[PDB]
Design a protein around this nucleic acid. Structure first.
Length: 612
RNA sequence: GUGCUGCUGUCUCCCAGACGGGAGGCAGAACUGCACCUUC
DNA sequence: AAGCATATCGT
DNA sequence: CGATATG
């Protein structure tokens, strides 16, 4: 089934027995060795229970007379490893009054009426018992009234606080068979044959980043009015009507301050390492002394003192200033939700990632300064500090999780608003990137799971040359390095520019809808006589060679203008397509550099910008 | 409920030691904001 | 590894 | 509808 969980708090033996159950399953048994094999089989199974009682060793003495139910419940809990209360453990009666729950555990001694602290997850809940041994909860996590079914409850104790896990089933939104057939059609290579969707679906091309948290483009099959036209496999062209950029920088000053402080904390650790070398060794190597003066001093924004005694004092003053600036930045980041800026605060912004990078850099700087004392041979000790920078780590993990949840919610919202039912995302599996903050697959897994729960199917497209190829001419352009938000291409021999993220979003959507009709790069090797044999590993390359040459293999034969061509063969060096001539690696880079030189002389003022 | 997520006063513990940093406990002031399958 | 179903006897 | 017992 599909499950969702949240906790409620109840304020005013089951563990004594849960711990006993865990230990018993792992480890009255007067001669445990003599019955070791059976015990092991039963514990591993958690029919065995029936066999154990026949042996006459299965009855035991529970820490606290749990009679039955509670007993079996805790047993199953330890197994799975939550003192559970089932309705088919001791039965419970979950009701709701006002804005809070009321759990009534039916213990053998009597009824235990427990009121729960009003949660903002199960806000304003309504509970009605069903005929299927369940409770139908209706709550508010807008005023969307989420619905769930509760059949089992669990009790735990954290820091002397008792918590109830309301693990409830829910029904994901209905997904049409047209969406499934359309995904099957569009995901398949051109070699295979799949039925057409035969419906007017909606496709959302998505590019993921950190500064533009994500950008999207929307297309509707069989509906082309105005926008960047894209071919569709075996159908008519479609126009990307809604193209947008979500996320982004909230306030420029805050982003700049986080970047500056992250750089300062990045260089501080290396500066104190070099100062520790200077205080101990007394001299530096040629590279380090050049590195310290040229890079570390202007980076840490410190004044280099020759005296080693007051060098530590200057370093401590600098670290105090760094911490004061960090506290100011954190307070300004907190105030986005507690001023008149409540309305203009975005769901997700570029500061959610800059703050994480700053937290990591400051953690490193503080961990380095705290160990400024150590000298030759101190190293690390089994003990020392058992909770060093615990608050920092807690904040980093909590902010990471919250950023992931808010990004997933933003993506899902944007997909639902635009009516999309198919979402082509970029396969980020294939610093200043989403990686080094999360696992490459974790973000994708979360996003597709939430989209599926909302009834939207998602597919990962190969993200190769999407940010370097124009979405109109389907040719290589210039991605500006001074400003990474402008992508320069040529059209009718006139240089145009576009947003470099909606460009990649449209390229992702185009690759999805055209079923990878065109490839911008081919891997080949030189056999002899200037003939570059094409290396075919992916099925997409096999389909591409069939459509252009006519055979599942081909070679690059040279021409006069340092270019190549596809021929085809009857039965490892990159090559970039360019204008149908398959320029080699060096010539492709030369062409890109020529484009960059041409666009730098022209000036962006005379370069028109297309709709975005 | 869990976080985003902090401020002020005061107190305790630790590492340098006399420039500073890291765990936490209470008491207050402001805020009605966003998101959340937890659990192992 | 987890976060229940049916089935009939007896009263 | 309660008491087990097993899909």
């Amino acid at each position: 089934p599909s499950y969702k969980s949240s906790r409620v708090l109840v304020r005013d033996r089951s563990h004594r027995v849960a711990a006993f159950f865990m230990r018993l399953l792992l480890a009255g048994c007067e001669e445990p060795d003599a019955v070791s094999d059976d015990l092991r089989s039963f514990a591993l199974a958690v029919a065995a229970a029936l066999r154990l009682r026949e042996r006459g060793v299965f009855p035991v003495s529970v820490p606290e007379h749990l009679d039955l139910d509670s007993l079996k419940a805790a047993m199953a809990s330890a197994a799975e490893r939550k003192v559970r209360f089932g309705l088919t453990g001791r039965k419970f009666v979950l009701s709701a009054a006002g804005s809070r729950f009321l759990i009534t555990v039916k213990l053998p001694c009597g009824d235990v009426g427990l009121t729960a602290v009003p949660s903002r997850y199960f806000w304003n809940p309504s509970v009605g018992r069903t005929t299927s041994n369940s409770f139908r909860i209706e709550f508010t996590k807008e005023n969307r009234r989420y619905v769930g079914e509760v059949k089992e409850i669990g009790l735990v104790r954290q820091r002397g606080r008792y918590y109830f896990f309301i693990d409830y089933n829910f029904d994901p939104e209905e997904v049409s068979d047209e969406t499934k057939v359309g995904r099957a059609f569009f995901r398949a290579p051109l070699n295979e044959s799949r039925p057409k969707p035969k419906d007017k679906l909606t496709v959302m091309g998505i590019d993921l980043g950190i500064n533009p948290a994500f950008a999207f483009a929307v297309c509707t099959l069989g509906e082309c009015q105005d926008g960047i036209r894209s071919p569709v496999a075996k159908m008519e062209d479609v126009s990307f009507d809604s193209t947008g950029l979500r996320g982004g920088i909230g306030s420029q000053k805050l982003h700049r301050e986080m970047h500056n402080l992250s750089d300062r904390c990045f260089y501080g650790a290396r500066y104190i390492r070099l100062s520790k070398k200077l205080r101990d060794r007394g001299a530096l190597n040629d590279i380090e002394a050049r590195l310290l003066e040229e890079k570390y001093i202007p980076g840490f924004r410190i004044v280099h003192i020759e005296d080693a005694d007051e060098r530590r004092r200057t370093v401590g003053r600098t670290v105090k200033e760094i911490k004061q600036e960090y506290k100011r930045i954190r307070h300004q980041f907190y105030l986005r939700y507690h001023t008149s800026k409540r309305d203009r605060t975005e769901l997700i912004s570029a500061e959610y990632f800059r703050m994480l990078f700053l937290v990591k850099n400051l953690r490193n700087l503080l961990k380095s300064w705290n160990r400024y004392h150590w000298t030759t041979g101190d190293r690390e000790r089994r003990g020392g500090n058992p909770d060093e920078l615990k608050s920092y780590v807690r904040y980093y993990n909590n902010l990471r999780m919250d950023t992931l949840k808010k990004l997933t919610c933003a993506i899902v919202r944007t997909a639902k608003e635009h009516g999309a039912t198919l979402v082509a995302m970029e396969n980020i599996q294939r610093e200043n990137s989403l990686l080094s903050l999360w696992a490459p697959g974790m973000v994708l897994e979360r996003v597709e799971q939430e989209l599926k729960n909302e009834g939207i199917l998602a597919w990962e497209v190969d993200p190769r040359h999407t940010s370097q190829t124009s979405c109109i001419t389907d040719e290589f352009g210039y991605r500006s390095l001074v400003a990474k938000d402008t992508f320069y291409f040529e059209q009718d021999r006139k240089i145009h520019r576009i947003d470099a993220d909606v460009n990649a979003a449209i390229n992702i959507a185009r690759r999805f809808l055209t079923r990878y009709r065109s490839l911008t790069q081919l891997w080949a090797s030189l056999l002899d006589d200037g003939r570059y044999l094409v290396n075919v590993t992916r099925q997409h390359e096999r389909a591409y060679l069939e459509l252009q040459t006519g055979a599942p293999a081909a070679t690059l034969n040279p021409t006069a203008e340092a270019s190549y061509e596809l021929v085809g063969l009857s039965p490892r060096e990159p090559f970039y397509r360019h204008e149908g001539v398959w320029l080699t690696r060096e010539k492709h880079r030369e062409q890109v550099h020529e484009l960059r030189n041409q666009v730098l002389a022209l000036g962006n003022a005379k370069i028109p910008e297309i709709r975005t």
